[PDB]
């Protein structure tokens, strides 16, 4: 019933009693189970009960549960929902809903800081012109000069029968990717299809392995258009080495602000398909992902040549060693340049203490171990030793299709 | 598309469907509501021969003769013995599959793409602990190969209604003590404290060394356990240097060839076999990063660090993250230079990807437990990192059972 939570480090046990919240089904069923899987594989009572359930967390959270504010609301929610099909949050109660989607994302190691988010009403957005310069305020809110500031903006949420307000980047500052002649890419190659998406509907390609993307947005049953980001609001970290002097000369960089776009938020059954957020890399994200993993930047063997090391052979280690020295050339390169970033093992630290804190607040925290331990030295880190139960908590974050 | 889980692989972009899930007959942990997927150990005649016919057909399957006269005899054989005496016995054959394909079943072994090569000794004859003491030296011996290690199971007698187990109390048959201090801390291998102290008990006169081979604690059944201790020539070690830090080899680390489970159930047919002990050969991060770096093991990491001078003050030197790499290619290096048979985590990961499309066509998928696959250290490096795979039980199989004291 209640799952036994072990920690083979320390032998402590706990047991969650917070995933009895739980009112969405995920992919493990008793005959097998699917928590390895990246993806999903896919009226008025149910919006109903999940608007209910929602007002009720939210005056429990303000500690006015019961009072006639508390009566009142849901009698708004109610007379609402009965004559439109739908209903609309309270600024203050979007403000509680989109923490708590953060509080309950199993994927994140940064939620020891879920409290402190910093949210933007955009929901008297009616234009993808307008949804550019929200985005950029939260550019520059969440940037701060490298002191990087966590922010969420949200955008109207989804209505039936009319299209959503989409952005079509998956994050909102990305590199191009740039399918060559022989078949090669030239940037990122996460970001081939995007690209080609953004040159059809006419921005004019630069040719660079770091070329920060434009936007695609989309207002409702309309075709996306394109912005430039002003160059001046994308903080970028040129890419250095503490000891070996030839690192820098590879020329790689990476932008400061990592901040997803593709995301629908989910609070008290309403829909929010454009609402993207932002908090600050953790290094493994850049070091180890994003310049190490084949289907990225891939620069592992290049690295490892430059440090003359042996290639020719697995169990040398060169892999290994190469991404190391890639990730202390992040944690070196963001701290020289007083952007903030956070290391694996500091990061999941704080996860541990989280996890704490959740127990001792909620009775468990949802998690997904596959995700929580860094990709490199896992082991090395806390989380790796601490059992974990996963499970959909709502608010949310899911994910959804991209639009196109 | 089709009613299965679809698994995909990130790096590459393929898809595949697991259909072989659809023969698991028993049911782990998950639920459609919470996945306890990363929980290390989750929670009558009628159901034998259930079990007996399942694994009957496995094994008429394998040799094609499925629907044939002797399949049907078989089982008639197998329904009259479970009938008369409440068990039964596996043929010679039968239990040579069983055991094989128990070890291809097995979600957590990333050494799978070997497991048609599995020597099987039956020992299904052996009637007392010096006996047992025998066949387990035989299997060290055989196993161990002056480092050219081959994989073996020895199968001791089957679990018996109404008689007591015969059992191995080691979980393996070759690890280290670990003696409680006065000052509360551990010398030796704190995993292995208590059955340290059992073997003691038992009248073992204990070492004071980092690495003291511990002796056999053997339970034949409805017997007190009896101590066997190792001839040291039988137990093959590599003593662990660096290629190029010169000072590693002062540490005086070593570690043992053979790594040899001892204390897990073999379920073949519903017969429960609780004394199976069986072993490959190791994956360099066993040694390296678990054994030596874990916290709660011999947690040598800031050690190695202060000999490599890093600033083990901050966490952003990642001088966890150096001294590990460096302690794991101190394992590669030194197993290579004794020639004692050893895979580093790349070549194991590459050849259990490979394994996982053998079994794709074999069998129409592969039960894999993620979090036990892919390594501790530099995981996204490996390619099973990107791999989705489907967790299932599937029988014949290997289970944890509780330690017998
Ligand atoms: C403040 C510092 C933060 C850190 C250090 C952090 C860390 C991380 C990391 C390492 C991941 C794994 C992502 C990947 O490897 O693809 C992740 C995922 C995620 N984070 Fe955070 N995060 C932070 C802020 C936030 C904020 C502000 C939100 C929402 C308001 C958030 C919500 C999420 C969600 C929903 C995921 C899952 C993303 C996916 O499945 O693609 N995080 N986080
Ligand atoms: C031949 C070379 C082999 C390699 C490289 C290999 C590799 C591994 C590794 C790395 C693990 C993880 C254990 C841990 O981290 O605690 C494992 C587990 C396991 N292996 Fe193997 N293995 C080999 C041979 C075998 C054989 C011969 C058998 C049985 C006939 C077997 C059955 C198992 C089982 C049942 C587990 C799960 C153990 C547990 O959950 O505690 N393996 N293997
Ligand atoms: N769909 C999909 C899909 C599948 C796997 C990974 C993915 C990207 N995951 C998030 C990556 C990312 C990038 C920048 N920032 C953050 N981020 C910010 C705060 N927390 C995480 N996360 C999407
Ligand atoms: N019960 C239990 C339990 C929980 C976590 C880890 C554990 C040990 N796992 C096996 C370790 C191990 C040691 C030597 N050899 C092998 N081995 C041999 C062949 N394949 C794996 N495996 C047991
Ligand atoms: C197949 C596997 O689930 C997939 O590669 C996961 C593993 N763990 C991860 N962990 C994080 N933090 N981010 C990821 O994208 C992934 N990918
Ligand atoms: C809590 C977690 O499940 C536990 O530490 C697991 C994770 N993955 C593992 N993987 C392997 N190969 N061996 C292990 O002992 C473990 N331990
Ligand atoms: O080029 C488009 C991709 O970046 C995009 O499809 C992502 O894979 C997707 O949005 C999930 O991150
Ligand atoms: O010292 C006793 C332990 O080694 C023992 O309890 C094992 O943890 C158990 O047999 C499973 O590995
Ligand atoms: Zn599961």
């Given at each position: 019933k209640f799952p036994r939570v072990k920690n083979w480090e320390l032998g402590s046990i706990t047991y969650d009693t917070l995933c009895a919240q739980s009112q969405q089904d995920g992919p493990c069923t008793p005959r097998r189970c699917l928590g390895s899987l990246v993806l999903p594989r896919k009226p008025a009572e149910q919006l109903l009960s999940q608007a209910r359930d929602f007002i009720n967390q939210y005056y429990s959270s303000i500690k006015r549960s019961g009072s006639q504010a508390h009566e009142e609301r849901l009698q708004e929610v109610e007379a609402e929902v009965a004559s439109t099909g739908t209903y609309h949050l309270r600024e203050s109660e979007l403000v509680f809903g989109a923490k708590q989607a953060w509080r309950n994302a199993p994927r994140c190691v940064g939620r020891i800081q879920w409290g402190k988010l910093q949210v933007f009403d955009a929901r008297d957005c009616s234009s993808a012109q307008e949804m550019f310069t929200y985005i950029c305020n939260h550019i520059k809110y969440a940037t701060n000069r490298g002191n990087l500031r966590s922010a969420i903006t949200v955008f109207p949420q989804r209505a039936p029968g009319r299209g959503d307000?989409?952005?079509?980047?998956?994050?909102?500052?990305?590199?191009?990717?740039?399918?060559?002649?022989?078949?090669?890419?030239?940037?990122?190659?996460?970001?081939?299809?995007?690209?080609?998406?953004?040159?059809?509907?006419?921005?004019?390609?630069?040719?660079?392995?770091?070329?920060?993307?434009?936007?695609?947005?989309?207002?409702?049953?309309?075709?996306?258009?394109?912005?430039?980001?002003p160059p001046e609001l994308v903080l970028e970290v040129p890419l250095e080495h503490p000891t070996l002097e030839w690192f820098?000369?590879?020329?790689?960089?990476?932008?400061?602000?990592?901040?997803?776009?593709?995301?629908?938020?989910?609070?008290?059954?309403?829909?929010?398909?454009?609402?993207?957020?932002?908090?600050?890399?953790?290094?493994?994200?850049?070091?180890?992902?994003?310049?190490?993993?084949?289907?990225?930047?891939?620069?592992?063997?290049?690295?490892?040549?430059?440090?003359?090391?042996?290639?020719?052979?697995?169990?040398?280690?060169?892999?290994?060693?190469?991404?190391?020295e890639i990730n202390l050339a992040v944690l070196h390169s963001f701290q020289l340049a007083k952007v903030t970033i956070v290391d694996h093992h500091a990061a999941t630290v704080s996860f541990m203490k989280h996890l704490d804190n959740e127990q001792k607040a909620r009775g468990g925290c949802p998690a997904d171990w596959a995700w929580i331990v860094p990709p490199i030295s896992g082991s090395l880190t806390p989380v790796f030793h601490q059992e974990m139960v996963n499970y959909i908590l709502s608010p949310a974050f899911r994910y959804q299709p991209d639009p196109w």
């Amino acid at each position: 019933k209640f799952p036994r939570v072990k920690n083979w480090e320390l032998g402590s046990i706990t047991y969650d009693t917070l995933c009895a919240q739980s009112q969405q089904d995920g992919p493990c069923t008793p005959r097998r189970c699917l928590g390895s899987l990246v993806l999903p594989r896919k009226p008025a009572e149910q919006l109903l009960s999940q608007a209910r359930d929602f007002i009720n967390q939210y005056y429990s959270s303000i500690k006015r549960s019961g009072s006639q504010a508390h009566e009142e609301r849901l009698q708004e929610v109610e007379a609402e929902v009965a004559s439109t099909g739908t209903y609309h949050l309270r600024e203050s109660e979007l403000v509680f809903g989109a923490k708590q989607a953060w509080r309950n994302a199993p994927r994140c190691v940064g939620r020891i800081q879920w409290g402190k988010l910093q949210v933007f009403d955009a929901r008297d957005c009616s234009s993808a012109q307008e949804m550019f310069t929200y985005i950029c305020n939260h550019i520059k809110y969440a940037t701060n000069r490298g002191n990087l500031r966590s922010a969420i903006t949200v955008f109207p949420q989804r209505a039936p029968g009319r299209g959503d307000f989409r952005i079509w980047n998956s994050q909102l500052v990305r590199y191009a990717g740039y399918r060559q002649q022989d078949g090669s890419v030239r940037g990122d190659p996460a970001n081939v299809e995007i690209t080609e998406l953004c040159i059809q509907h006419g921005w004019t390609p630069g040719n660079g392995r770091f070329d920060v993307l434009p936007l695609l947005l989309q207002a409702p049953d309309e075709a996306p258009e394109l912005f430039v980001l002003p160059p001046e609001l994308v903080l970028e970290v040129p890419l250095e080495h503490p000891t070996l002097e030839w690192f820098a000369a590879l020329g790689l960089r990476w932008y400061a602000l990592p901040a997803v776009s593709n995301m629908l938020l989910e609070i008290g059954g309403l829909e929010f398909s454009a609402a993207p957020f932002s908090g600050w890399y953790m290094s493994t994200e850049i070091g180890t992902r994003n310049l190490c993993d084949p289907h990225r930047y891939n620069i592992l063997e290049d690295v490892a040549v430059c440090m003359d090391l042996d290639t020719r052979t697995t169990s040398s280690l060169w892999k290994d060693k190469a991404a190391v020295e890639i990730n202390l050339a992040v944690l070196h390169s963001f701290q020289l340049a007083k952007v903030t970033i956070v290391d694996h093992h500091a990061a999941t630290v704080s996860f541990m203490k989280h996890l704490d804190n959740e127990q001792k607040a909620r009775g468990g925290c949802p998690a997904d171990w596959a995700w929580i331990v860094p990709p490199i030295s896992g082991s090395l880190t806390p989380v790796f030793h601490q059992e974990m139960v996963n499970y959909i908590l709502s608010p949310a974050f899911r994910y959804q299709p991209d639009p196109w």
